[PDB]
Scaffold this active site. Structure first.
Site, mmCIF file in Angstrom:
data_model
loop_
_atom_site.group_PDB
_atom_site.id
_atom_site.type_symbol
_atom_site.label_atom_id
_atom_site.label_comp_id
_atom_site.label_asym_id
_atom_site.label_seq_id
_atom_site.Cartn_x
_atom_site.Cartn_y
_atom_site.Cartn_z
ATOM 1 N N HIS A 99 0.803 -1.216 0.000
ATOM 2 C CA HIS A 99 0.000 0.000 0.000
ATOM 3 C C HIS A 99 0.836 1.266 0.000
ATOM 4 O O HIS A 99 0.467 2.238 -0.659
ATOM 5 C CB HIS A 99 -0.942 0.017 1.210
ATOM 6 C CG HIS A 99 -1.965 -1.077 1.193
ATOM 7 N ND1 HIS A 99 -3.258 -0.885 0.754
ATOM 8 C CD2 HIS A 99 -1.880 -2.379 1.554
ATOM 9 C CE1 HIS A 99 -3.925 -2.022 0.846
ATOM 10 N NE2 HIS A 99 -3.112 -2.944 1.328
ATOM 11 N N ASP A 123 -6.494 5.432 1.307
ATOM 12 C CA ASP A 123 -6.518 4.023 0.939
ATOM 13 C C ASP A 123 -7.936 3.475 1.045
ATOM 14 O O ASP A 123 -8.702 3.860 1.933
ATOM 15 C CB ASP A 123 -5.569 3.228 1.837
ATOM 16 C CG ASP A 123 -5.088 1.936 1.193
ATOM 17 O OD1 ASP A 123 -5.929 1.143 0.720
ATOM 18 O OD2 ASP A 123 -3.858 1.716 1.158
HETATM 19 O O1 LIG Z 1 11.965 -8.413 -1.651
HETATM 20 C C1 LIG Z 1 11.148 -7.586 -2.114
HETATM 21 C C2 LIG Z 1 9.782 -7.849 -2.054
HETATM 22 C C3 LIG Z 1 8.878 -6.927 -2.568
HETATM 23 N N1 LIG Z 1 9.344 -5.803 -3.123
HETATM 24 C C4 LIG Z 1 8.432 -4.796 -3.664
HETATM 25 O O2 LIG Z 1 7.325 -4.661 -2.772
HETATM 26 C C5 LIG Z 1 6.107 -4.547 -3.503
HETATM 27 C C6 LIG Z 1 5.218 -5.718 -3.124
HETATM 28 O O3 LIG Z 1 3.868 -5.412 -3.437
HETATM 29 P P1 LIG Z 1 2.878 -6.592 -3.879
HETATM 30 O O4 LIG Z 1 3.414 -7.217 -5.144
HETATM 31 O O5 LIG Z 1 1.486 -6.018 -3.893
HETATM 32 O O6 LIG Z 1 3.066 -7.674 -2.695
HETATM 33 P P2 LIG Z 1 2.251 -7.647 -1.305
HETATM 34 O O7 LIG Z 1 2.455 -6.296 -0.675
HETATM 35 O O8 LIG Z 1 2.627 -8.879 -0.512
HETATM 36 O O9 LIG Z 1 0.710 -7.762 -1.757
HETATM 37 C C7 LIG Z 1 -0.347 -7.400 -0.872
HETATM 38 O O10 LIG Z 1 -0.916 -6.157 -1.285
HETATM 39 C C8 LIG Z 1 -1.322 -6.179 -2.659
HETATM 40 C C9 LIG Z 1 -1.775 -4.792 -3.106
HETATM 41 O O11 LIG Z 1 -2.898 -4.369 -2.326
HETATM 42 C C10 LIG Z 1 -2.413 -7.226 -2.870
HETATM 43 O O12 LIG Z 1 -2.747 -7.300 -4.261
HETATM 44 C C11 LIG Z 1 -1.931 -8.584 -2.376
HETATM 45 O O13 LIG Z 1 -3.008 -9.524 -2.410
HETATM 46 C C12 LIG Z 1 -1.423 -8.471 -0.946
HETATM 47 O O14 LIG Z 1 -0.884 -9.730 -0.528
HETATM 48 C C13 LIG Z 1 6.452 -4.617 -4.978
HETATM 49 O O15 LIG Z 1 6.462 -3.291 -5.514
HETATM 50 C C14 LIG Z 1 7.848 -5.199 -5.009
HETATM 51 O O16 LIG Z 1 8.595 -4.654 -6.102
HETATM 52 C C15 LIG Z 1 10.728 -5.555 -3.167
HETATM 53 O O17 LIG Z 1 11.136 -4.492 -3.684
HETATM 54 N N2 LIG Z 1 11.591 -6.449 -2.668
#
Ligand SMILES: O=c1ccn([C@@H]2O[C@H](COP(=O)(O)OP(=O)(O)O[C@H]3O[C@H](CO)[C@@H](O)[C@H](O)[C@H]3O)[C@@H](O)[C@H]2O)c(=O)[nH]1
Ligand SMILES: O=c1ccn([C@@H]2O[C@H](COP(=O)(O)OP(=O)(O)O[C@H]3O[C@H](CO)[C@@H](O)[C@H](O)[C@H]3O)[C@@H](O)[C@H]2O)c(=O)[nH]1
Lengths: 456, 447
Positions: free
Chosen positions: B15, B110
């Protein structure tokens, strides 16, 4: 036709030198009966035996079936075969007397001397023990009734001075702890078995003058014990082709081929694990901190009981991640061809618990040793190497489990051994003597002929 | 004289990341931005990202929204505890926001906070919006849920949810988050209360674009999902920004990727946090070595997961790396050595994969992730296995995993489609692209 019977005790540390001695006797054109106690304890023994019998189908395997031993002292499967043999060795007499061609000699494991001595005397043949450890450790075993009768034993004793042996002063800290307890089974077996050496025709030790000159001369010149039979230094027992597993992935050798010469420290604590989990983490942490390339061979925590625990279960995730990043180390859980490893020019050091078979192999390949003795004879074996100047061990680390040896202590000891050209040059000298011992007219051939002279 | 926007993100990197990228887009349009930061921030990843963002944009006013700690009887999930605190302490915001100079022009918060923040936004009297951080198709499901809940077939009889005209036309019952099938669940009540409040907004921002969700964007703005829904602004793709780069990061990952053949590496990441059991993780490693493909596996902190044969192959064959750290996912997805992405299909990762043209092997675990995975599969640049189930339903074995990996890594039809999705993603941010047009349309009423 000279016929020799062989009876090893349980464990790869006893079976391996017995099968190598068998190979030596077959080259001298003997007929060999290999007595095999059944059921054999470990799969590694099963595989080595079948590989050996396949390579030498002319040897007669006499199956020695053992009834079940129920002991309150220990549940260990290796101890239970040992308990079986010394309670059911009467079964061997019909199998050995009614045997053709007539037996010329009987060689059994030193650990089985009490049950097997009356068996051998009933057969009327020259009988010997094969001692699977160092001649210096044998000197301690032969001297033990003399040592236990002293008033210094057990509390006052500071150093054991056995006349003329390769380790002139053995500190109390190097004596196996059970041998300091008059109530232990270990102490009782030593006090019972050691006086029986006088009944033997001779003692065979996998050693040579290049590593245990003083101990061998002391044992044979009546210096250690009066009335000792002759002690034959028939080492080094060199690795044989039948030991090599038929289909190996070669990937360990392929990995060694990609490292600089003398760059890799090889780590093995023996046939079985005798090290706790907390200590094993510190080992992996010490190998990573040392900065040297390493090949660490680990064993299954319980023999023939594999587990699905990950390497990060034992060592921890961050340690494993840092390992794969730096690219310097292998950790394998399998039975490796240790001779192929020690013989590779990429290996420049050997972290060993100093089991005597591994010490002799390192001498054969001229690899300096960082001794990490854990139990039993290993502190005495490590000081045999240290006295020869081709190895080093830390006497303050203690027996296994006494204290936790930190990863930084381990790393600094590794860097010490891997950078010490004095140890490497002395190991090369030990290797040259080891090669001379098995040459024509060398000490091994001389000692073997001296044995074969009596038989026929 | 300046346009002033206030942004309020919910907890979690899923988020904060789209909100900070939206802030970057708004700063490029010469807006003054106030970033409302609920404090104490939950995770260190949010801490370090926030400081890197404020350092990169010192013109941004950070308004600290101090929250009282929620009680232990509320939850053990630190992200739900912040939710509970915001619902009860939202009255604090109205003083801080009304007494703010320059006066606020708009307010974007949000969607998870729509219930406690809607009365706050109405007292401020400025146009207010939600940023939905997931897909437009998932948003169509959220907006349509009151209509779905009042059906005869809900919940036991229903086999398919048919939202008119969206990108995935029939959402199977097996893709609906299980709590939303329980009319006594907390998740159900939150959906039923928050969804009708959508009609009281001025608009909805979604990090998406026509290249990946054309149908569901059309149906939302055409009144085909809910009559009288406010406009939905497809303002994606939110592209990675510089402030996300950790200034002094090691290069072991990039140096390892530089030694691999182009398109030979499978990147494996299940998101911002741990969401998979240990015995399942043990099968992931077995599947990676059994697939025969080079891999980069990122594991998140919560007997071992790293098996012996796995470690041996990584050291001898140099086939794989396993790291437990916050990696630069954009640097990995942008590397030509990476040819496949095993993703839980969190929406930010999906949009990033679309931005870099990396085909996806979807492994959805919770919530919106099965719907998101089908959005990719419907687009033809990804694949997922419906039979694997929600996380923890059954053990997906290494041989199943290895088979799925070899399928995606060998499928040039998926790679070419992902290249086409990438071209639309680049077009969306160019002059005259959909992102610019949607941002100007969104900002025209702001004063
Ligand atoms: O080692 C890491 C891991 C993640 N990221 C970044 O972190 C973000 C991760 O976001 P996302 O892909 O949405 O993963 P989550 O935050 O785990 O997802 C949660 O939030 C999302 C957006 O609301 C929902 O779609 C999912 O269901 C929910 O699990 C991305 O931009 C990645 O590039 C990194 O840079 N390095
Ligand atoms: O992965 C492996 C491990 C071992 N070996 C071989 O197995 C033998 C191991 O014998 P040793 O070095 O003596 O280790 P252990 O058998 O564990 O030693 C036991 O037996 C020795 C001889 O009696 C005693 O000195 C020790 O105290 C006792 O622990 C050696 O020949 C090795 O070459 C392999 O080939 N591969």
């Amino acid at each position: 036709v000279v016929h020799v019977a062989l009876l090893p005790s349980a464990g790869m540390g006893h079976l391996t030198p017995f099968l190598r001695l068998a190979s030596l006797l077959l080259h001298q054109h003997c007929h060999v009966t290999l007595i095999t106690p059944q059921p054999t304890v470990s799969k590694a023994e099963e595989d080595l035996l079948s590989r050996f019998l396949s390579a030498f189908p002319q040897v007669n395997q006499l199956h020695f079936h053992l009834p079940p031993s129920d002991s309150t002292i220990s549940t260990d499967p290796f101890f239970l075969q040992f308990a079986s043999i010394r309670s059911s060795s009467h079964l061997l007499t019909p199998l050995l007397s009614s045997l053709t061609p007539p037996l010329s000699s009987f060689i059994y494991d030193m650990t089985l001397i009490s049950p097997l001595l009356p068996i051998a005397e009933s057969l009327g043949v020259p009988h010997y023990i094969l001692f699977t450890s160092s001649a210096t450790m044998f000197s301690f075993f032969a001297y033990f009734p003399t040592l236990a009768k002293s008033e210094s034993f057990p509390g006052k004793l500071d150093f054991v001075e056995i006349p003329g042996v390769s380790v002139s002063s053995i500190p109390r800290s190097s004596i196996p702890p059970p041998l300091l307890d008059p109530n232990s089974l270990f102490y009782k077996l030593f006090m019972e078995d050691s006086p029986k050496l006088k009944k033997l025709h001779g003692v065979l030790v996998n050693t040579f003058e290049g590593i245990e000159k003083e101990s061998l001369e002391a044992l044979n010149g009546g210096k250690v014990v009066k009335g000792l039979p002759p002690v034959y230094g028939v080492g080094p027992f060199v690795p044989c082709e039948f030991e090599k597993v038929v289909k190996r992935g070669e990937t360990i050798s392929e990995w060694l081929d990609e490292q600089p010469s003398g760059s890799v420290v090889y780590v093995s604590f023996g046939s079985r694990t005798a090290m706790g989990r907390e200590q094993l983490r510190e080992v992996g942490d010490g190998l990573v901190k040392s900065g040297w390339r390493f090949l660490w061979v680990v064993k299954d925590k319980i023999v023939d009981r594999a587990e699905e625990e990950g390497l990060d279960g034992v060592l921890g995730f961050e340690l494993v991640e840092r390992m794969v990043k730096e690219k310097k180390g292998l950790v394998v859980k399998e039975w490796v061809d240790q001779s192929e490893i020690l013989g590779h020019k990429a290996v420049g050091g050997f972290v060993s618990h100093c089991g005597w078979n591994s010490v002799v192999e390192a001498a054969w390949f001229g690899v300096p040793i960082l001794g990490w003795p854990l139990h039993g004879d290993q502190k005495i074996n490590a000081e045999v190497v240290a006295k020869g100047g081709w190895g080093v061990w830390k006497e303050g680390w203690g027996w296994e489990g006494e204290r936790l040896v930190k990863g930084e202590e381990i790393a600094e000891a590794i860097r010490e051994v891997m950078n010490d050209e004095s140890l490497r040059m002395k190991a090369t000298q030990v290797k040259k003597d080891a090669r001379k011992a098995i040459s024509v007219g060398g000490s091994q051939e001389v000692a073997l002929q001296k044995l074969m002279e009596v038989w026929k």
